[PDB]
Design a protein around this ligand. Structure first.
Ligand SMILES: [Zn+2]
Lengths: 475, 21, 105, 137, 190
C-alpha cells in the first residue's frame, strides 16, 4: 500500500534509501517512485563524476512534467579544488527547472563570489531566485561587490550565511537572519559595510558578524551608526572584529532608543582597548532645559542572555548596569563575562576601585539566572571565590557554570563552593577544562560524592572556542 | 557551519598569465 | 582523603591559632610598619614568621601533629591563613618558620 | 463509556472508548463497532497495545520494539493492518520498528530478511549499481 | 597463577603459624616480639623450613627472586593476625635468612650461581652511605592525570611506557608525597 511507504522511508537518510533501491527490483520501484521523500542531499564532499551521476539521477527521476517537488536541504562541497568549478557549473546549468531547492549550503571555498553570481545568471535554472536559505563558504573579492547582488538576485532569501574563508583580487524585507563569518587573517575589509549602512533590513531577527575589520576612514561605521538600521533585532552576536569597540557601542546604547527588544547580546572585541566605564554622565543642554534621556534601560531591559567575553568592561560598569537596573535581572537568565581583565572581586587588595565587580550587589539584582561563564578569568583566584561561597543564596537558579581555562583556581574553591551549593540536589553542570590547579583526587571526590551531576576536567584541552557552539569567529 | 582544513595550493604557467601584459 | 576538602577547615583553624596567640599578629604588623617606614623616606624585612610548635601543640595537638607528620598538607593552608592575616592588616605570599621541641624529628 | 469491537473474522472484544478511538476513522465508519478488515490475532494485539498505551497521548519506544518483536511475515501483517481502517498510534510504531530492523542491512541481508529473491537481472543490477555511487558513504 | 601464588603465601603463613619445637611456637613468638620493639622483620632458619616441609624449601631455592616477596607478604599477614584485632598500618616485613649450607668461597662464584641463594664469607672493605629505594610508587599521567601505582619487590620494574588509558608518548610521573621508600646500603666484600 502506497500510504505507508513515506512513513517507512522518511526515517532513513536519502543516501541510505538510494542504496536500499538495490534490495530488489520491486522495492527499487517502490523507493524510486516516491520523489517527495528525498528531502535532504548531504552530498559533501563529492567528486565530479559522482556529482554528474547524482545530477543525472535528477534528470531521470525528479524531472516530472508537473511542477511539484522541492528539496529542504542541499549540501554541496567538492572533493577537489578544480572540480569545485565543474560541480557548480553543472549545478546551475542542469538542475531540473520544475524542482526547487529550498535551502542551499554551497560550501565551495575556491569559488569567488563573482563566479557564483555569474554562474547563477548564465545557468538560468532560476531556483536561485526562489530558494529560502543560502550558505556560501567562498572566496571574497573586494572590487565587484557581487555578494550584495546575491540578495538582490534572491528576493525569497530569509537566512544568509557568508563564510569568507579567503580573499582574492533599498529595502530587504525578506531577510530574517544574517551571518557574516570572516577569516580575520585574510578579510582585511568589511564586505557588507556599504549595504549595511545604506540599506534597511526590517524583518531581521538575528545578526551575526565576526572577523571583519571596521574601516578607520568612516567613523560612522566605528560608531555603529549603521546598526540603527535594524529594529526588532532579537539577537545580536558580534565577535573578533578587530577595530570595533565596546566603548563606541555603549555610546549608541546611550543616545538612542535603538531597539524595542533584544533578547540576546554577544559583543566580543579581541584586543585590550582602554578601560570602558558605564557613561552615566547625563548632560544638560542648558540648566534652563531638560537633560538628554539616556536610553540604556529601554535598550537593554529585554536581555535574556548577555555575553561580554573579553570586552575590557570594568567591574563597576557591570555593577552600574545592575544598580541602575538597565539590565532587568528577572528577564536576564544567562551571563558570560569571561576573559575580561578589568573585573576584580571585593577580596582583592591591589586595584583601582572602579574595576571591582560587587558580586553581592549584582547577584542580588539578577538572582534567577541559570548559566554563568567566567572562563579565562584569571582574576577569579581562590580568595575571590570566597565571595561566591558567601553569595550562594543569591544564585540558587544556577545550573550551568563555566570557569574553565583558569590557571589559578585551585580545587579547594571548587569543593567549598560545591559543598555550600549543596546546602540548597547537585549542580547540573560544571566546566573546568584546561585548569591546571584542579587536583585529580578532588575532582574524583566531586564525582564520588556526586556534588556535580556532570563535571568536565579535560586538562589537555588547550582552547575554549568550539566553532559554531561557543564562537562564530572563524577557525 | 564547519571549521576549515588546509590543502596545499599549487601554481603553474596558465595561458592567462602568459597573455598578461 | 582529598586535602582540598579539609583545606578550609585547616585555614580557619590556623587563623584561630593566630588570633589565640596575638604575638604573631603583632609581629606581622611590626614587619609591615618597619617596611612601610623604610619605604616612606629614602633594610627591608622578609615576609616570614617563626611560630612556636609548643603554642600550636597546646592550641590543637591534631593540627600540630599534622604539621610534623604531614607538612605538605598542613603548611600551605597555615601559610595561606598567615597571608590572609597579613592582608587583613592595613595596606605577596607570607612564609612560616618553626621552633621548639621537635622530639623524634 | 465502553464499546464492543467486532473483528474481521467474527469474534468480539470490549474496551474503554478512548482505546477504540485510537482507530481514528471510527467516528465516520461506525456500544458496538464493526471492524471488518482486521484479523483476530492482530485485533487482539491492537487492543492489548492500546490497553498498555491507555496512559499515552500524541501530538522508537522500547516497549513497542519488544512488543512488536515477532515473525517477519506476522509483523508485516501488523503493518498491513491499521490502514484500510486507520489506526495511527500502532502504525507509527510499526513503521519505526521496521526502519530499526532495516537500518544496518545490506541488500543481500534485506533479501534474506524480508524473505525475497534477488528479482533483478544481474547485469542490469550492475548497471544501476553503476549509477548509485554518489549515494555511497 | 595468582591462585598458585596465594597457595605459596598460605603455605608460608601455615609455616609461621604451625612451626613448633619443644612446646614453643618460635616464629609466632619471634614475630610478636619483633612487632613489640617495632622492627618489622623476621629471622628464619632454613633448617627449620626444610624440617617443616622440604617442598617449600625447594620452591624457595629454585627461584628466590619470586618466592621471597611471597614469604614477606605471608609474614605481613601473620603479623596483622597476631597483633591487631581486625574487625573492631604495618609495612612490608623484611625476611632475614639463617643458613648452614656449605659456603661457596667468593672466588668460586660464577655464572652457574646466578639467582641461586648463596652463602659466602669475607671482609667488608667499604660501606656506602644510605640510599632510598621505592617500595610503593604513586604514579600520575602528565596529560590526563590518570593515577595508578607500582608496588615493588626489591629483588629484580620501571615506569610504564605509555598511558594505561592522544595522551603523549612517555607520560608518567611519580607523586613523591604518597610514595613509600626504604633504606638501601651498598657494601664491598673482599
Ligand atoms: Zn594519560
Amino acid at each position: 500500500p502506497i500510504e505507508i511507504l513515506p512513513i517507512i522511508f522518511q526515517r532513513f537518510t536519502t543516501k541510505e534509501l538510494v542504496t536500499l533501491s538495490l534490495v530488489c527490483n520491486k522495492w527499487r520501484d517502490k523507493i524510486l517512485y516516491h520523489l517527495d521523500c528525498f528531502q535532504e542531499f548531504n552530498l559533501a564532499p563529492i567528486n565530479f563524476k559522482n556529482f554528474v551521476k547524482f545530477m543525472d539521477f535528477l534528470q531521470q527521476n525528479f524531472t516530472r512534467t508537473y511542477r511539484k517537488y522541492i528539496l529542504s536541504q542541499v549540501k554541496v562541497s567538492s572533493r577537489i579544488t578544480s572540480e569545485e568549478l565543474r560541480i557548480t557549473q553543472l549545478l546551475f546549468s542542469k538542475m531540473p527547472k520544475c524542482i526547487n531547492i529550498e535551502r542551499l549550503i554551497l560550501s565551495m571555498p575556491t569559488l569567488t563570489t563573482t563566479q557564483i553570481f555569474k554562474l547563477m545568471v548564465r545557468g538560468g535554472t532560476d531556483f536561485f531566485t526562489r530558494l529560502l536559505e543560502l550558505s556560501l563558504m567562498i572566496t571574497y573579492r573586494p572590487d565587484k561587490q557581487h555578494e550584495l547582488e546575491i540578495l538582490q538576485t534572491c528576493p525569497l532569501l530569509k537566512k544568509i550565511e557568508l563564510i569568507f574563508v579567503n580573499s582574492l583580487v533599498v529595502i530587504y524585507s525578506e531577510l530574517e537572519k544574517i551571518t557574516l563569518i570572516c577569516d580575520k587573517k585574510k578579510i582585511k575589509n568589511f564586505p557588507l559595510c556599504r549595504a549595511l549602512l545604506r540599506g534597511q533590513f526590517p524583518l531581521l531577527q538575528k545578526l551575526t558578524i565576526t572577523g571583519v575589520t571596521f574601516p578607520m576612514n568612516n567613523q560612522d561605521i566605528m560608531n555603529f551608526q549603521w546598526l540603527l538600521n535594524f529594529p526588532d533585532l532579537k539577537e545580536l552576536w558580534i565577535e573578533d572584529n578587530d577595530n570595533c569597540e565596546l566603548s563606541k557601542f555603549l555610546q549608541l546604547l546611550k543616545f538612542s532608543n535603538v531597539w524595542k527588544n533584544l533578547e540576546k547580546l554577544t559583543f566580543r572585541e579581541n584586543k585590550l582597548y582602554p578601560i570602558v566605564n558605564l557613561d552615566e554622565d547625563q548632560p544638560v543642554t542648558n540648566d534652563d532645559e531638560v537633560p538628554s534621556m539616556l536610553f540604556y534601560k529601554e535598550n537593554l531591559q529585554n536581555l535574556e542572555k548577555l555575553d561580554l567575553m573579553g570586552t575590557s568592561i570594568s567591574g563597576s560598569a557591570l555593577t552600574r548596569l545592575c544598580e541602575q537596573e538597565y539590565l532587568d535581572g528577572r528577564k536576564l537568565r544567562s551571563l558570560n563575562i569571561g576573559n575580561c581583565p578589568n573585573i576584580q572581586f571585593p577580596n582583592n587588595h591591589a586595584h583601582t576601585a572602579r574595576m571591582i565587580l560587587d558580586v553581592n550587589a549584582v547577584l542580588k539584582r539578577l538572582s534567577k539566572l541559570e548559566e554563568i561563564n567566567l572562563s579565562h578569568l584569571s582574576s577569579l583566584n581562590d580568595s575571590t571565590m570566597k565571595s561566591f561561597i558567601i553569595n550562594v543564596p543569591f544564585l540558587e537558579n544556577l545550573k550551568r557554570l563555566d570557569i574553565s581555562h583558569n590557571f589559578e583556581i585551585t580545587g579547594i574553591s571548587i569543593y567549598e563552593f560545591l559543598k555550600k551549593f549543596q546546602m540548597d540536589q547537585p549542580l547540573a553542570y560544571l566546566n573546568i577544562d584546561g585548569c591546571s590547579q584542579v587536583s585529580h583526587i578532588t575532582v574524583n571526590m566531586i564525582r564520588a560524592q556526586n556534588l556535580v551531576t556532570q563535571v568536565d576536567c579535560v586538562y589537555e584541552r588547550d582552547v575554549w572556542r568550539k566553532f559554531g557552539i561557543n564562537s562564530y569567529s572563524y577557525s | 557551519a564547519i571549521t576549515a582544513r588546509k590543502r596545499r595550493p599549487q601554481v603553474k604557467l596558465t595561458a592567462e598569465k602568459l597573455l598578461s601584459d | 582523603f582529598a586535602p582540598d576538602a579539609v583545606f578550609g577547615d585547616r585555614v580557619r583553624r590556623f587563623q584561630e591559632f593566630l588570633d589565640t596567640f596575638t604575638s604573631y599578629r603583632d609581629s606581622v604588623r611590626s614587619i609591615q610598619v618597619y617596611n612601610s617606614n623604610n619605604a616612606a623616606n629614602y633594610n627591608i624585612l622578609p615576609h616570614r614568621i617563626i611560630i612556636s610548635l609548643d603554642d600550636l601543640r597546646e592550641f590543637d595537638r591534631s593540627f600540630w601533629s599534622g604539621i610534623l607528620v604531614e607538612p605538605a598538607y598542613f603548611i600551605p593552608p597555615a601559610e595561606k591563613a598567615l597571608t590572609d592575616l597579613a592582608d587583613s592588616m592595613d595596606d605577596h605570599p607570607w612564609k612560616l618558620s618553626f621552633k621548639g621541641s621537635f622530639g623524634a624529628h | 463509556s465502553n464499546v464492543v469491537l467486532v473483528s474481521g473474522e467474527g469474534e468480539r472484544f470490549t474496551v474503554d472508548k478512548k482505546i477504540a478511538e485510537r482507530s481514528l476513522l471510527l467516528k465516520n465508519y461506525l456500544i458496538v463497532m464493526p471492524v471488518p478488515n482486521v484479523r483476530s490475532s492482530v485485533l487482539q494485539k491492537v487492543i492489548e497495545w492500546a490497553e498498555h498505551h491507555r496512559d499515552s497521548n500524541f501530538p522508537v519506544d522500547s516497549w513497542d520494539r519488544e512488543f512488536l518483536k515477532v515473525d517477519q511475515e506476522m509483523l508485516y501483517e501488523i503493518i498491513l493492518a491499521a490502514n484500510y481502517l486507520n489506526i495511527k498510534p500502532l502504525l507509527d510504531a510499526g513503521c519505526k520498528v521496521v526502519a530499526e530492523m532495516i537500518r544496518g542491512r545490506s541488500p543481500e541481508e534485506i533479501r534474506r530478511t524480508f524473505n525475497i529473491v534477488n528479482d533483478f537481472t544481474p547485469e542490469e543490477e550492475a548497471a544501476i549499481r553503476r549509477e548509485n555511487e554518489w549515494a555511497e558513504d | 597463577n595468582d591462585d598458585d601464588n596465594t597457595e605459596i603465601i598460605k603455605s608460608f603463613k601455615n609455616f609461621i603459624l604451625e612451626f613448633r619445637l619443644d612446646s614453643q611456637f618460635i616464629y609466632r613468638d619471634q614475630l610478636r616480639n619483633n612487632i613489640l620493639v617495632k622492627n618489622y622483620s623476621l629471622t628464619v632458619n632454613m633448617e627449620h623450613l626444610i624440617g617443616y616441609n622440604e617442598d617449600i624449601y625447594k620452591k624457595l631455592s629454585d627461584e628466590p627472586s619470586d618466592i621471597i616477596p611471597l614469604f614477606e607478604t605471608a609474614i605481613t599477614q601473620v603479623a596483622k593476625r597476631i597483633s591487631i584485632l581486625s574487625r573492631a598500618s604495618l609495612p612490608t616485613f623484611q625476611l632475614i635468612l639463617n643458613s648452614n649450607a656449605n659456603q661457596i668461597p667468593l672466588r668460586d662464584l660464577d655464572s652457574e650461581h646466578v639467582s641461586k641463594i648463596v652463602r659466602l664469607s669475607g671482609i667488608i672493605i667499604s660501606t656506602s652511605v644510605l640510599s632510598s629505594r621505592a617500595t610503593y610508587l604513586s604514579i600520575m599521567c602528565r596529560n590526563c592525570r590518570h593515577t595508578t601505582s607500582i608496588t615493588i619487590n626489591n629483588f629484580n620494574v620501571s615506569l610504564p611506557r605509555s598511558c594505561l588509558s592522544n595522551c603523549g608518548p612517555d607520560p608518567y610521573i611519580i607523586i613523591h608525597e604518597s610514595s613509600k621508600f626504604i633504606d638501601q646500603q651498598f657494601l664491598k666484600l673482599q
